[PDB]
């Protein structure tokens, strides 16, 4: 709680400045402080939280993939032994990544999810929970890999169940959840057919509801629908 002495509003203000400066580690720390004030987050604030950590972990995942590739190549036949350094440094990055994931999951568990009653907030947080378990699953190789995968699945499934009951098929949160759960199926759960079915059905049901929307809502929904299409194109 290094941010314990800073006003909630000041933390939010600084998170926005940090975003403008592309200082995503700072942005995440500010938003962690804001969450730890204990008040619920507004929509704008939830998006600041998600953007900050997505950017931090996104960078860690990209670095982890570079290092894992180098490590895999070192373990091929005819590769000269270079010692423990590649594994050590991949492990260092991995540990830092896991730490960030644990931090986010911690904020969600203490106490964002339990206080979130509106569908838009609850689905958003449960999607985040699925996402950060998914990132843990990407690097998991041990006894708990199955349980980590199941934790992601469970969180996404709860979010899906609420979204289908409470939100229109074009709702950007419902769409983004479906996009990410579809990727979970393809990349984590070894279920490409489920991934493809989910993406297709989500796209088609959104298409059918676009007629209800304003120009601005149409823009928001079609943006994510295009991501669904992009993934379908990659996979088929």
């Amino acid at each position: 709680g290094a941010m314990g002495s800073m006003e909630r509003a000041s933390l939010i203000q600084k998170a926005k400045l940090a975003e403008q400066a592309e200082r995503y580690e700072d942005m995440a720390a500010f938003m962690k402080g804001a969450v730890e004030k204990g008040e619920e987050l507004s929509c704008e604030e939830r998006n600041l939280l998600s953007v900050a950590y997505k950017n931090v972990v996104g960078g860690q995942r990209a670095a982890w993939r570079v290092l894992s590739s180098i490590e895999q190549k070192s373990n091929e036949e005819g590769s000269e032994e270079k010692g423990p350094e590649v594994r050590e440094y991949r492990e260092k990055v991995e540990t830092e990544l896991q730490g960030v994931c644990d931090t986010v999951l911690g904020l969600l568990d203490s106490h964002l999810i339990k206080e979130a009653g509106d569908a838009e907030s609850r689905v958003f947080y449960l999607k985040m929970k699925g996402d950060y378990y998914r990132y843990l699953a990407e690097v998991a190789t041990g006894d708990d890999k199955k349980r980590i995968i199941d934790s992601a699945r469970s969180a996404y499934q709860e979010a899906m169940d609420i979204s289908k009951k409470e939100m229109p098929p074009t709702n950007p949160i419902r769409l983004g959840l479906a996009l990410n759960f579809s990727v979970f199926h393809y990349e984590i759960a070894n279920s490409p057919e489920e991934a493809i079915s989910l993406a297709k059905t989500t796209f088609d049901e959104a298409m059918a509801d676009l007629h209800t929307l304003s120009e601005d809502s149409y823009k928001d929904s079609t943006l994510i629908m295009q991501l669904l299409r992009d993934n379908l194109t990659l996979w088929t």
């Binding site: 990410n180 990727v183 990349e187 991501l227 992009d230």
Partner: peptide
């Protein structure tokens, strides 16, 4: 790598 949001 596939798109996520």
């Amino acid at each position: 790598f596939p798109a996520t949001v």
